[PDB]
Curated annotation (Swiss-Prot), chains A, B:
Organism: Homo sapiens (Human)
Protein name stated in the entry: Thioredoxin
Residues forming the catalytic site: C32, A35
Molecular-function annotations in GO: protein homodimerization activity; protein-disulfide reductase [NAD(P)H] activity; protein-disulfide reductase activity; RNA binding; thioredoxin-disulfide reductase (NADPH) activity
Induction, per UniProt: Up-regulated by ionizing radiation.
Gene that this sequence comes from: TXN
Consequence of substituting E70A: Strongly reduced interaction with CASP3
In-chain residues carrying the UniProt-annotated modification N6-succinyllysine: K8, K94
Site entry: Deprotonates C-terminal active site Cys: D26
UniProt function note: Participates in various redox reactions through the reversible oxidation of its active center dithiol to a disulfide and catalyzes dithiol-disulfide exchange reactions. Plays a role in the reversible S-nitrosylation of cysteine residues in target proteins, and thereby contributes to the response to intracellular nitric oxide. Nitrosylates the active site Cys of CASP3 in response to nitric oxide (NO), and thereby inhibits caspase-3 activity.
Segments crossing the lipid bilayer: none
UniProtKB/Swiss-Prot annotation, chain D:
Induction notes from the record: Down-regulated in response to oxidative stress.
UniProt keyword annotations, A-Z: Cell cycle, Cytoplasm, Disulfide bond, Isopeptide bond, Nucleus, Phosphoprotein, Transcription, Transcription regulation, Tumor suppressor, Ubl conjugation
Coiled coil: none
Name of the protein in question: Thioredoxin-interacting protein
Posttranslational mods: Ubiquitinated; undergoes heterotypic 'Lys-48'-/'Lys-63'-branched polyubiquitination catalyzed by ITCH and UBR5 resulting in proteasomal degradation. Deubiquitinated by USP5, leading to TXNIP stabilization.
UniProt similarity note: Belongs to the arrestin family.
A cellular component term, taken from the record's GO annotations: cytoplasm
One of the GO biological process terms: response to progesterone
Full-protein interval shown: 7 to 298 of 391
UniProt source species: Homo sapiens (Human)
Location of cross-link Glycyl lysine isopeptide (Lys-Gly) (interchain with G-Cter in ubiquitin): K199
Chief localization: cytoplasm
Oligomer and partners: Homodimer; disulfide-linked. Interacts with TXN/thioredoxin through its redox-active site. Interacts with transcriptional repressors ZBTB16, ZBTB32 and HDAC1. Interacts with DDIT4.
Annotated localization: Cytoplasm; Nucleus
Amino acid sequence: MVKQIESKTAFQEALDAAGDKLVVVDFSATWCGPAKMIKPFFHSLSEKYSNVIFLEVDVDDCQDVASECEVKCMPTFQFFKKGQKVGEFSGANKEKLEATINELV
Amino acid sequence: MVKQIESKTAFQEALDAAGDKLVVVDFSATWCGPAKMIKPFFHSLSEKYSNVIFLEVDVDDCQDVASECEVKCMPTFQFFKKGQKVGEFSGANKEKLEATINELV
Amino acid sequence: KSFEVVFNDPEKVYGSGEKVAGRVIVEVCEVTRVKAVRILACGVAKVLWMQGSQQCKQTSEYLRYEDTLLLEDQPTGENEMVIMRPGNKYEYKFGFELPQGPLGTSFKGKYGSVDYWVKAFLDRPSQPTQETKKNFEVVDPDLMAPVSAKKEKKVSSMFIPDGRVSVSARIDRKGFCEGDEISIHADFENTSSRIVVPKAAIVARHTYLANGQTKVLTQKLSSVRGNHIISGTCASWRGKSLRVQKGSNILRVEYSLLIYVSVPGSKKVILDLPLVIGSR
Amino acid sequence: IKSFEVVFNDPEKVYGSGEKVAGRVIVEVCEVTRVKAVRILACGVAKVLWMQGSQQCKQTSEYLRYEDTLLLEDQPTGENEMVIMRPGNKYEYKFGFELPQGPLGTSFKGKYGSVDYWVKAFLDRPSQPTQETKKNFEVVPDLMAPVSAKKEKKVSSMFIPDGRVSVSARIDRKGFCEGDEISIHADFENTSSRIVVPKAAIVARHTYLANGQTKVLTQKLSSVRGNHIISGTCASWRGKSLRVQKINILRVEYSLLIYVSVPGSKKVILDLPLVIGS
């Protein structure tokens, strides 16, 4: 499953509630073609990779989370450990998605 | 009768034949409406006034005598007694033409 | 006595490119000389609005035509004085063509007016020149209402046959004052194989008179560039700003904001939003 | 530069008066090329020429003079941004202009006249001389023969209900050289009640480019007055002459006017067109 982050406080709370586990964030938009396309796949991966925490931030609803994370396009995938960023790429590229996850767990 | 006059020296041959008697010259032209209108009247006057000598000069044929008499329009009528011009008027005016004859004879 | 402009079709509403023809008809009650009869034909629009406490104004000439008129009975022309005597009617014909462009429509309303008219002048020796004026009608959304558009283009690939590039953009109003910022909201989608580049520009088309033509000089004013947009992403501008900045034969200037996406090896995808730009 | 050509939409057409000429200027290049402008100049010029005895007389008249800077639909930004052209593409610039209503200069041809209608396109490039291409297009009585004209007008009175004023005139030819004299043979009739006055004048009608228009100024050049002609007389001119004076203008067109001023009425007018050369 993928958890929806509605706030900057809920964002903080998610990063810290995660321990030393990988946290991947889908920075997404509801109107964005590529973003909608990759969503089911980000979900399917969240079900396979049960050891990794999967979050989604809608950049329209949470503009401040997006700007603090410096997101400039969608989908952008950011990777966290203990509240610190260890990877990032942009684009509805599922194979890059899975390969980055495998690379950072 | 009116003497058609077709030369420069033939204008001297008529001005000489007249004694103390009055001559009248119709400086006319063939294309001129008023000169064609007056034409028969000038002939009828020549039959009536047999004591007076009538002459016709076509301005476009005798351009020579025209120039020397300083005719500038048609019909112009010039009146001479012994040979010295005593009268003159322009215009297809029958009553002025007869009146001028009676006035000069 | 009388001095009137008489249009041949007095009820016609004229469209771009049409000929406007009539007579200037002059009558006198007493013998008079006349140096001239001239006409001037003008078509001018003025858009006026308040931006807060500041008035902004765009004046646009659409027609500027002048000419000196002749009677048939004046065959040696424009200097030949004319002896106008009482009793009968004097008719000077005139005719001119309305310019091709988009002309402003005849208006008296919200944010200003559009007026077309013919003015006849009677010139006389030693007299001040008399005038007469007659209007004529011309036909070609709210100036403070938001302006928007969207365009989507197929940009196909062998491996992404359904590749596409789209842009939709919106600005809050059409009329801006020189020096104000246009804040642009726009969303761009790129599913094609290309890296595309969103850009915007204010473009001015100045209509001016030269040679014996109306011509248009097109000029790029301010522009901006956004980040490149890679295959398989979207981006958004959230109030990205563009600045609206600052002879005799210049009649008007028409302004558009271009919001477009440059697609390498393909045509641009272009939005053109018409603007009104006024000085303070 | 690979190709640079004017291609009309109908490449085999005779265009008429007030007719639209429309086409494309087409540019292709071998290599990446920056281009400042592509512009057109469309022109129509008649040249009327002859030799008086053995002197060189000619009058030149434009009927079309149109220039425009052409723009590419894929380059919306304006003329102060150059266009980058690349091999493999055909850059097509649309052009279109309307020909004039009335005389296209096709009046006198062959013996004395020639007509010329073309479009030049110019390619402007940074640090290069401008390159040009030119494509011609097709547009749709004896000059030295005597001219004779006549006009009569009714000028009535109560007492002369069928009064008339007439003028009939003759000149030696239509074409004269600056500095010549036009010798005039005329006959004038006046059966009206009025005293009338024959006059003649050479008039120059300037067709000139000013503002967004082609306008026309009528200028009176040399003139003569004749003696007044009283009611019921005629008069003649016999080799009365007028001097042909040396005078953004397209063309000047000339006329001999021969007319009779009639007090209380309108003039009776002959207009005889002339060709006057330098």
